[PDB]
Amino acid sequence: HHWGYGKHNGPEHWHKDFPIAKGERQSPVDIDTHTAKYDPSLKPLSVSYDQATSLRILNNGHAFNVEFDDSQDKAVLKGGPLDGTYRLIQFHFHWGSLDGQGSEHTVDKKKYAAELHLVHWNTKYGDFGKAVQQPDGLAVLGIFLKVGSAKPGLQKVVDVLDSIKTKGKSADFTNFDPRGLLPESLDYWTYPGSLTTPPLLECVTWIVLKEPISVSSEQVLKFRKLNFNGEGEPEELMVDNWRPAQPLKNRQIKASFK
Numbered sequence: 001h002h003w004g005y006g007k008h009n010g011p012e013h014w015h016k017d018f019p020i021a022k023g024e025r026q027s028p029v030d031i032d033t034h035t036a037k038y039d040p041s042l043k044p045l046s047v048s049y050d051q052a053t054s055l056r057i058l059n060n061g062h063a064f065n066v067e068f069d070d071s072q073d074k075a076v077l078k079g080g081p082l083d084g085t086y087r088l089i090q091f092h093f094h095w096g097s098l099d100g101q102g103s104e105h106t107v108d109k110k111k112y113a114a115e116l117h118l119v120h121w122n123t124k125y126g127d128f129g130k131a132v133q134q135p136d137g138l139a140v141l142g143i144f145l146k147v148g149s150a151k152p153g154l155q156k157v158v159d160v161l162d163s164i165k166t167k168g169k170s171a172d173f174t175n176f177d178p179r180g181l182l183p184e185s186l187d188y189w190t191y192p193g194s195l196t197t198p199p200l201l202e203c204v205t206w207i208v209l210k211e212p213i214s215v216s217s218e219q220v221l222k223f224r225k226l227n228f229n230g231e232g233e234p235e236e237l238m239v240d241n242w243r244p245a246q247p248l249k250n251r252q253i254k255a256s257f258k
């Protein structure tokens with residue numbers, strides 16, 4: 001498969017190899033704040049990242065992933081809309097070429113500069129590959145980034161990007177604390193959806209925080225110096241690696257807050 005974000009291999013093309021691209025629960029979506037309803041039934045959200053064990057950071061030619069040890073319940077997401085326990089496996093971002101675009105989810109059609117995806121899998125299914133075959137297999141915590149003040153807890157990420165410039169490069173990335181990427185409030189919207197990259201599987205409970213984090217222009221500029229290409233190939237800057245909003249179809253977005 002040779003998908004990407006360009007004219008010739010971008011999101012409009014994905015449905016030919018991945019027909020679920022035109023499915024009934026695709027992500028991202030626009031979150032219309034005047035149609036999402038507060039749901040008093042939602043339990044409190046629980047982000048338990050104290051024992052998180054980061055391992056490595058990888059440029060996969062589409063984004064970069066920070067990878068965690070998920071062989072036990074070290075960093076887990078529970079509560080909110082979720083039943084049971086979801087283990088953190090990795091995070092990554094989507095970002096733009098300019099500060100006015102980059103997020104995947106939008107808020108009243110507003111695009112943020114970037115969006116962070118913290119990807120977790122349901123432990124009742126034993127492993128990630130089994131979990132993605134289930135409608136409740138994953139929970140992705142989505143966090144918007146806006147440009148303003150620097151985010152200190154991001155800086156160790158931006159500083160390692162020089163070492164994974166091109167597709168296929170990885171670097172050791174131990175002792176990174178994903179708590180430093182969270183906003184103050186855990187107020188969220190939730191809806192059922194999908195992976196936003198091929199294979200676009202419809203296995204995700206999305207939990208999108210209302211409060212963005214601020215990052216500096218210098219920080220996001222360094223994201224934009226990555227490369228989609230491999231070493232010794234012509235340079236294609238890793239920018240605009242976001243899928244646009246997909247049809248909501250027969251889905252309701254619920255708010256955790258009034």
Ligand SMILES: O=C(O)c1cccc(Oc2ccccc2)c1
Pocket residue numbers: 117119132195196197198199
């Ligand atoms: O779009 C994402 O957030 C995402 C996150 C993790 C993995 C992933 O892609 C695969 C999932 C299962 C099998 C092969 C690839 C996509």
Ligand SMILES: [Zn+2]
Pocket residue numbers: 092093094117196
């Ligand atoms: Zn993502």
